[PDB]
Amino acid sequence: GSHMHLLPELASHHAVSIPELLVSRDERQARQHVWLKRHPVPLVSFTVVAPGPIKDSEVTRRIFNHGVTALRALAAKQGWQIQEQAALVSASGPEGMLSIAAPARDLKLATIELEHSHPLGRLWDIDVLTPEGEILSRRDYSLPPRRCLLCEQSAAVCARGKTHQLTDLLNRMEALLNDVDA
Numbered sequence: 001g002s003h004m005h006l007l008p009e010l011a012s013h014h015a016v017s018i019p020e021l022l023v024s025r026d027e028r029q030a031r032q033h034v035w036l037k038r039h040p041v042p043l044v045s046f047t048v049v050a051p052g053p054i055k056d057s058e059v060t061r062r063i064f065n066h067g068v069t070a071l072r073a074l075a076a077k078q079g080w081q082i083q084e085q086a087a088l089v090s091a092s093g094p095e096g097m098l099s100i101a102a103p104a105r106d107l108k109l110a111t112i113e114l115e116h117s118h119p120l121g122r123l124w125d126i127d128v129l130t131p132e133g134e135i136l137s138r139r140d141y142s143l144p145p146r147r148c149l150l151c152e153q154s155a156a157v158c159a160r161g162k163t164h165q166l167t168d169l170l171n172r173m174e175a176l177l178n179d180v181d182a
């Protein structure tokens with residue numbers, strides 16, 4: 001476990017290379033599996049939308065810190081115990097892990113609702129893994145796919161189609177943060 005709030009002014013602004021990000025996804029899967037073996041309960045694996053090479057910034061830390069607060073409030077409201085929790089900075093930027101003694105399907109459904117209904121939920125990537133390592137998905141419940149941050153089409157096809165400009169994604173992140181932290 002660790003403290004989970006990341007001081008925004010201490011952002012590293014680490015520049016992530018393409019192979020560094022590719023390696024990190026295998027490291028993240030291994031780290032997830034360690035947590036599932038230490039505490040055999042569902043795991044929340046939380047990252048923030050962080051486009052471009054610099055993923056640990058004052059903006060992404062501020063977004064992340066709101067998400068930590070919301071996830072802790074979700075667990076308390078649903079009556080689920082957090083058995084362990086930690087935050088780190090990876091090649092994906094701020095990253096949170098929470099082992100939660102909840103039913104895995106209930107937890108994923110709750111985080112889907114959080115991503116939809118919190119004003120900053122569009123900027124959160126909240127994964128939920130079962131103790132067998134299954135990554136749960138909106139598709140498992142026949143729910144519509146996650147929408148693109150900037151339009152009504154699915155985020156997957158706008159990402160694959162490189163539809164939107166990096167600057168426009170970053171500027172929307174700033175604008176949403178300013179809208180909540182007036």
Ligand SMILES: [Zn+2]
Binds near residue numbers: 150151152153158164
């Ligand atoms: Zn789009």
